[PDB]
Amino acid sequence: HHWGYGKHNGPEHWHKDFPIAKGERQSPVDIDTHTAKYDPSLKPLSVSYDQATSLRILNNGHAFNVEFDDSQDKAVLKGGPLDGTYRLIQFHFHWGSLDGQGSEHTVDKKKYAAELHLVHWNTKYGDFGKAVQQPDGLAVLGIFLKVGSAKPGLQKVVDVLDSIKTKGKSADFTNFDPRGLLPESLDYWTYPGSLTTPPLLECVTWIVLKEPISVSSEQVLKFRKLNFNGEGEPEELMVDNWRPAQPLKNRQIKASFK
Numbered sequence: 001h002h003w004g005y006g007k008h009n010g011p012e013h014w015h016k017d018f019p020i021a022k023g024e025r026q027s028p029v030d031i032d033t034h035t036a037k038y039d040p041s042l043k044p045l046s047v048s049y050d051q052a053t054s055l056r057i058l059n060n061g062h063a064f065n066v067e068f069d070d071s072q073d074k075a076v077l078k079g080g081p082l083d084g085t086y087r088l089i090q091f092h093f094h095w096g097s098l099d100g101q102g103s104e105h106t107v108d109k110k111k112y113a114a115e116l117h118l119v120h121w122n123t124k125y126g127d128f129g130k131a132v133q134q135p136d137g138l139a140v141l142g143i144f145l146k147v148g149s150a151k152p153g154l155q156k157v158v159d160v161l162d163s164i165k166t167k168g169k170s171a172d173f174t175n176f177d178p179r180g181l182l183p184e185s186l187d188y189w190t191y192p193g194s195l196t197t198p199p200l201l202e203c204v205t206w207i208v209l210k211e212p213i214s215v216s217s218e219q220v221l222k223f224r225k226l227n228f229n230g231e232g233e234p235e236e237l238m239v240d241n242w243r244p245a246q247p248l249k250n251r252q253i254k255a256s257f258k
């Protein structure tokens with residue numbers, strides 16, 4: 001029926017409805033640190049989120065998205081391996097039922113508790129819908145979460161979750177600053193890949209940060225309280241909404257550091 005992360009509609013079945021699932025540039029992937037090529041030509045990332053305007057948070061049935069106003073160059077990413085300006089449209093997470101799983105990308109086969117995705121689209125394409133149809137249409141910043149100390153800047157997010165518990169619920173969510181979710185270092189790995197949920201379009205330049213951010217056990221615990229189902233439907237906790245690593249194929253992972 002429709003795709004999800006259960007046994008009957010999970011990642012292993014997606015190819016039946018979205019054949020690109022077995023494509024040449026699918027994500028996520030395992031990052032082999034000893035095979036990644038340091039590339040001295042990659043520039044430092046430029047994250048300008050001081051003018052970021054958050055608008056709302058929504059449970060879409062597969063994760064929760066925080067959405068931003070992308071009608072102007074308010075929150076942008078540039079530099080790194082990118083040409084042009086990429087505007088932030090939304091962020092969301094992937095997480096596990098247990099602390100030893102949850103991330104999509106892995107590092108030398110290590111899985112983290114969760115993975116944050118900051119999605120941006122290439123302004124030359126005019127809108128999100130056109131950007132996904134192009135090989136360089138999106139730039140996703142991925143950040144790993146490990147469980148340790150609480151992340152103060154994530155608390156406002158944790159606290160509104162009760163109000164968007166089931167699929168299709170939304171809540172006003174203004175004045176959230178995404179700078180509070182960045183690690184100290186912007187060192188990264190980069191490779192050409194795809195969206196990690198259907199339609200799995202291969203339109204993404206991934207920028208994966210080397211340094212994880214820490215969140216407390218209690219913080220991640222609140223994520224696991226969301227539901228995949230809509231209100232008044234049988235309860236299915238939103239856990240394990242991650243796609244496993246895909247074959248690298250003909251691709252090189254480049255590192256911005258040594």
Ligand SMILES: [Co+2]
Nearest residue numbers: 092094117196
């Ligand atoms: Co994602």
